[PDB]
């Protein structure tokens, strides 16, 4: 019928019309967006990557573009706008092939040979690095940050990132860097210059009673439970309906807790992390004061992520009651440190602890909260660049030059395919070049001149040379010294491949019942 053909055409056309204005990235290009919602919220945006993270779309093919940026951030963390504009280039090609009269099924496995040759040719132009060498890990992460916002924070946050990975990674052949290993904390107090990389686990726990155990005399405890006490987890033997009756259960409550807090002081375990399983704000506010009198670093209803790292890093497992004399599945600590920069900030450092071979932690400080946030996103992107090299060690050019450099070569390999897919991939191999032109296209007057000029100079440049990405003009971008990892691009190859293939798998749109 006409209905499956028209929806697949419209499923392409809707998300592509979304993706048309997404070609506005790479720096100062265009006009600002004060966005008003259907509810009326003022949304003043300038950063297109967060725009893709916040992107509210009702069209479901355009809703895959949300996950496309989510998958790009979790795999590479780099070029979240880049995976979309090449997927918009995918939506360019699929229209006319249907207008030619090609099956959408054939265009689905057309995407395989584009992916298979694409990861092959980018491998041929890339050069690997050595993942025990401090220099080669340093040259690429800063060069990416030089294309990013910070340039003076790139000098300090990058060698902190290089020493961060070498704690987490093994010698050269290894794939072990997770975002669920390194916690990026926030500390009011200190500054960006006062930031510190701590070898071990540093948890962001709010710890009352600064002036606490600051020494190596420490063990750490992750408790899934709370201390059993009258009117905490035991019971009172009288009834309370009076203010005079209320005082009698308060006295027997805090009396037994004083017997509880000394036995944890007897243990040497100075840290207690309490889960979110409340009874009366699970462990009593009378109980936290007597733990603080025993100088024990405690918090209640802590987040789930803090529980996950302390079980992961040292190996801390839940134990029995301290009246039941805990089964020593608690972690062995060699530092419990409460941190105070300018008298502010509540932070726990555990230095020299056991590790499974990974999990370094950072202390990101800042004079304001905004001063925290500037270095927080900056070192986090500095982690993701080397993380691509850990998962795949190779060097390609940065700035989208291998996107067109693949395109100059792939069309030759498109001729060698000689299939029906030869015409499909070549139709997309010509669609990949658009990234300097169409990013420039959405600005002002005199429109016809610049567009194809920004793509001739690479084809004139060669399969080996093209236009520069930081000053423009034909030069070797490696001689311009602009680098990025291969996993920045080849993940953007595969993630865009499956989604637009899945658009070909769409027919006869439905809604649940």
């Amino acid at each position: 019928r006409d209905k499956p053909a028209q929806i697949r055409f419209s499923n392409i056309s809707a998300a592509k019309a979304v993706a048309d204005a997404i070609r506005t990235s790479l720096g100062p290009k265009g006009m600002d967006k004060m966005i008003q919602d259907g509810k009326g919220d003022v949304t003043i945006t300038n950063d297109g990557a967060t725009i893709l993270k916040q992107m509210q779309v009702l069209h479901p093919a355009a809703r895959m573009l949300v996950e496309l940026s989510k998958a790009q951030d979790i795999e590479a963390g780099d070029g979240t706008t880049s995976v979309v504009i090449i997927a918009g280039s995918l939506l360019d090609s699929c229209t006319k092939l249907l207008q030619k009269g090609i099956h959408p099924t054939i265009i689905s496995e057309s995407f395989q040979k584009a992916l298979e040759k694409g990861i092959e040719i980018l491998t041929d132009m890339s050069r690997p690095v050595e993942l025990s060498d401090r220099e080669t890990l340093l040259n690429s992460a800063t060069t990416s940050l030089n294309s990013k916002v910070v340039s003076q924070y790139s000098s300090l946050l990058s060698p902190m990132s290089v020493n961060a990975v070498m704690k987490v990674i093994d010698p050269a052949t290894a794939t072990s860097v997770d975002l669920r290993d390194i916690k990026i904390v926030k500390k009011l107090g200190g500054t960006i210059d006062d930031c510190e990389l701590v070898e071990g686990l540093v948890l962001t726990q709010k710890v009352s009673n600064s002036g606490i155990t600051r020494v190596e005399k420490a063990k750490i405890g992750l408790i899934q439970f709370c201390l059993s006490a009258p009117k905490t987890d035991m019971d009172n033997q009288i009834v309370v309906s009076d203010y005079a009756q209320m005082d009698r259960v308060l006295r027997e409550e805090r009396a037994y807790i004083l017997n509880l807090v000394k036995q944890i002081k007897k243990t040497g375990c100075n840290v207690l992390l309490i889960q979110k399983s409340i009874l009366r704000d699970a462990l009593s506010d009378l109980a936290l004061h007597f733990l603080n009198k025993m100088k024990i670093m405690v918090i209640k209803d802590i987040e789930r992520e803090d529980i996950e790292f302390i079980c992961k890093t040292i190996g801390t497992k839940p134990v029995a009651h301290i009246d039941q004399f805990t089964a020593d599945m608690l972690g062995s600590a060699e530092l419990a440190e409460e941190v105070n920069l300018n008298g502010s900030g509540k932070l726990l450092k555990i230095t020299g602890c056991a590790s499974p071979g990974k999990t370094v932690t950072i202390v990101v400080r800042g004079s304001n909260k905004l001063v925290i946030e500037e270095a927080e996103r900056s070192i986090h992107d500095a982690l993701c660049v080397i993380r691509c090299l850990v998962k795949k060690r190779a060097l390609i050019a940065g700035g989208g030059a291998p996107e067109i450099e693949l395109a100059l070569r792939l069309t030759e390999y498109s001729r060698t395919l000689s299939g029906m897919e030869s015409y499909c991939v070549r139709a997309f191999a010509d669609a990949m070049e658009v990234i300097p032109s169409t990013l420039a296209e959405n600005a002002g007057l005199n429109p016809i001149s610049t567009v194809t000029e920004l793509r001739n100079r690479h084809a004139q440049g060669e399969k080996t040379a093209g236009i520069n990405v930081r000053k423009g003009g034909i030069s070797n971008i490696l001689e311009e010294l602009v680098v990025q990892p291969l996993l920045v691009s080849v993940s953007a190859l595969t993630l865009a491949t499956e989604t637009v293939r899945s658009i070909l798998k769409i027919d006869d749109v439905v809604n649940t019942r």
Binding site: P28, K29, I35, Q36, I44, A440, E441, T450
Partner: protein, 178 residues
């Protein structure tokens, strides 16, 4: 309004929304044109329905105004930056930039690299500052034909109380030294 209204955020996607904000910025700039300089015209501006004020200070005007466009918005933001510096020179930055954001989209479009028009703006800015340091042709007040008295007398002639300012010239010379 031009451009589609079916989409949200007042998005018109292209030359219409680039033609929208050149109208939104110039109308802000046109307010300062009436109130420009010491000869600039005073505007009676109603605050809610009955409260009014009479101003020709552009920064005071922009405190009254509530922006509904980014072209309305960023002109209020950049002018308040000069306002916390001195409060003077805030009038000049508003009027010029309305023509500038007509000229910038036409050429940053035309990239070999998009910041070259912006660096051309900054090179024009740095070309000014060099010749700004080369200026002694007009405006010396550190001396005159006699002294700072010659600066202050013409300054007290610029502020009219009649033909006077002759005895008042010596006050301004003493004030940085008293």
């Amino acid at each position: 309004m031009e451009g589609p209204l079916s989409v949200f955020g007042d998005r018109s996607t292209g030359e219409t929304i680039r033609s929208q904000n050149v109208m939104a910025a110039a109308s802000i700039a046109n307010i300062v044109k009436s109130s420009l300089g010491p000869v600039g015209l005073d505007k009676m501006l109603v605050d809610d329905i009955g409260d009014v004020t009479i101003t020709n200070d552009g920064a005071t005007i922009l405190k009254l105004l509530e922006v509904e466009h980014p072209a309305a918005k960023v002109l209020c933001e950049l002018a308040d930056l000069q306002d916390k510096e001195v409060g003077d020179g805030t009038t000049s930055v508003v009027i010029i930039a309305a023509e500038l954001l007509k000229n910038a989209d036409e050429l940053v479009k035309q990239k070999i690299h998009p910041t070259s028009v912006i660096s051309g703006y900054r090179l024009a800015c740095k070309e000014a500052v060099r010749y700004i340091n080369e200026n002694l042709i007009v405006n010396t007040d550190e001396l005159g034909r006699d002294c700072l008295i010659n600066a202050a007398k013409t300054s007290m002639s610029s502020k009219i109380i009649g033909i006077n300012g002759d005895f008042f010239a010596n006050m301004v010379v003493d004030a940085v030294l008293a």
